[PDB]
Amino acid sequence: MKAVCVMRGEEGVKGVVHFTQAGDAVKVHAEFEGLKPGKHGFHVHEFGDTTQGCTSAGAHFNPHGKNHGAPDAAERHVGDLGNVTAGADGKATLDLTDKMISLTGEHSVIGRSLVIHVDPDDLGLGGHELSLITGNAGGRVACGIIGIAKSE
Amino acid sequence: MKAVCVMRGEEGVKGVVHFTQAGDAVKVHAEFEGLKPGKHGFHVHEFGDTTQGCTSAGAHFNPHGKNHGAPDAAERHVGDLGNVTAGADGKATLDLTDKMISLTGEHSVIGRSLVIHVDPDDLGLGGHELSLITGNAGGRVACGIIGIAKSE
Ligand SMILES: [Cu+2]
Ligand SMILES: [Cu+2]
Ligand SMILES: [Zn+2]
Ligand SMILES: [Zn+2]
Ligand SMILES: [Zn+2]
Ligand SMILES: [Zn+2]
Ligand SMILES: [Zn+2]
């Protein structure tokens, strides 16, 4: 099973993100250009709604109502995929394996949204009231809808 | 259960389409501007892939291997939602109930694409080589990925 998400928002920011269901895990391959050098929070938000740009994407996909956290943490949202690190040339690549999200079933992220943020995801540890909620990653630089892709 | 699809394409063409499911019946509500007057084929295509504009949307969503038909025909693709009619000023509106598509299960259209065509869907009767495949509706004026929406 395969998924793709093309991400857009602020001028110059471009992102493509491939997903591949591999048994009980999903492999994620994401690339970006046009980012500010440094770390950017990267999440699956709940809605595939772009009627209000990235704003209508809602909050972090959290079907279990748990606290925000790191991809590798005990407590986290299904949609918590950490930070994307933008290099000096404003470009980033991120590969990961996540057994939280799915391309099928109740954890499916099909038809939901990917959002990349202005600031870093403090991963629930920032000591800010937003930390266990959004990771305090600030505003939404680009977002996109997760659509079914050709499962070759 | 709700779903939304923001459609976009050639200069000027805008479109928003809301889905609401109750039981086996999906209400499809569409508002378009910027179209050429007359009928435009209107289908759910298989992929929510926008890596190559609307081209990567693939062909019509057809999980049961049927020929193309009108929405109310004996035989049709799941994704066959017929024609949208654009007025003399380019505006169009559609409100149709369909019991083939779904926002869930094997017929789920979540994360697939909505496409609108430059020419009319001949409903599989136009007697042309592409009639029973695509309804001979020609190129693609606009599309969007169908995303999960606030169900309220
Ligand atoms: Cu986020
Ligand atoms: Cu079509
Ligand atoms: Zn790549
Ligand atoms: Zn979170
Ligand atoms: Zn669960
Ligand atoms: Zn068809
Ligand atoms: Zn069926």
Side-chain angles (χ1 to χ4, degrees), chain A residues 11-74:
Chain A
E11 86 145 59
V13 182
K14 305 194 292 193
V16 61
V17 177
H18 293 270
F19 303 76
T20 305
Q21 181 88 41
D24 63 355
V26 174
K27 270 95 203 315
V28 181
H29 174 66
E31 302 184 348
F32 298 82
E33 59 188 64
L35 290 175
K36 302 285 155 289
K39 290 181 185 165
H40 297 280
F42 180 58
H43 313 105
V44 183
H45 299 228
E46 190 175 8
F47 305 120
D49 186 336
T50 57
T51 61
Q52 300 294 330
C54 292
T55 311
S56 36
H60 297 183
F61 181 48
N62 187 14
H64 299 333
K66 257 86 190 191
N67 271 344
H68 176 81
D72 67 325

Side-chain angles (χ1 to χ4, degrees), chain A residues 60 68 77 80 133:
Chain A
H60 297 183
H68 176 81
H77 303 140
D80 292 340
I133 313 174

Side-chain angles (χ1 to χ4, degrees), chain B residues 33-55:
Chain B
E33 67 179 61
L35 292 173
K36 304 287 192 299
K39 296 181 186 187
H40 300 268
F42 178 62
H43 317 108
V44 177
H45 285 232
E46 196 181 357
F47 311 127
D49 189 327
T50 50
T51 51
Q52 181 81 82
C54 297
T55 295

Side-chain angles (χ1 to χ4, degrees), chain B residues 21-85:
Chain B
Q21 177 149 13
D24 65 344
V26 181
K27 167 178 195 67
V28 180
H29 196 272
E31 294 153 347
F32 293 98
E33 67 179 61
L35 292 173
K36 304 287 192 299
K39 296 181 186 187
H40 300 268
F42 178 62
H43 317 108
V44 177
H45 285 232
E46 196 181 357
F47 311 127
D49 189 327
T50 50
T51 51
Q52 181 81 82
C54 297
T55 295
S56 26
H60 294 182
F61 182 45
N62 180 208
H64 292 310
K66 298 296 187 193
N67 286 338
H68 175 87
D72 62 340
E75 176 165 338
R76 57 171 268 193
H77 298 142
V78 170
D80 296 350
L81 301 171
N83 278 305
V84 160
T85 300

Side-chain angles (χ1 to χ4, degrees), chain A:
Chain A
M1 182 146 41
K2 270 182 164 65
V4 70
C5 178
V6 176
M7 306 173 65
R8 295 282 113 95
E10 296 182 357
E11 86 145 59
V13 182
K14 305 194 292 193
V16 61
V17 177
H18 293 270
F19 303 76
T20 305
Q21 181 88 41
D24 63 355
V26 174
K27 270 95 203 315
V28 181
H29 174 66
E31 302 184 348
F32 298 82
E33 59 188 64
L35 290 175
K36 302 285 155 289
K39 290 181 185 165
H40 297 280
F42 180 58
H43 313 105
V44 183
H45 299 228
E46 190 175 8
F47 305 120
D49 186 336
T50 57
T51 61
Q52 300 294 330
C54 292
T55 311
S56 36
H60 297 183
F61 181 48
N62 187 14
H64 299 333
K66 257 86 190 191
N67 271 344
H68 176 81
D72 67 325
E75 273 295 274
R76 54 162 270 200
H77 303 140
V78 163
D80 292 340
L81 305 180
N83 291 304
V84 170
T85 304
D89 56 4
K91 288 190 175 185
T93 288
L94 181 66
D95 307 271
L96 65 180
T97 300
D98 197 83
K99 307 179 64 178
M100 306 292 284
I101 67 187
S102 188
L103 296 189
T104 184
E106 317 193 34
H107 290 215
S108 187
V109 174
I110 302 299
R112 313 194 181 264
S113 60
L114 231 37
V115 174
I116 185 179
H117 285 281
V118 180
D119 302 301
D121 187 338
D122 73 22
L123 312 181
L125 308 161
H128 182 296
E129 73 185 359
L130 278 177
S131 297
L132 328 69
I133 313 174
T134 59
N136 193 207
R140 306 175 191 187
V141 147
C143 59
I145 308 165
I146 307 168
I148 305 187
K150 189 170 215 66
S151 196
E152 66 234 332

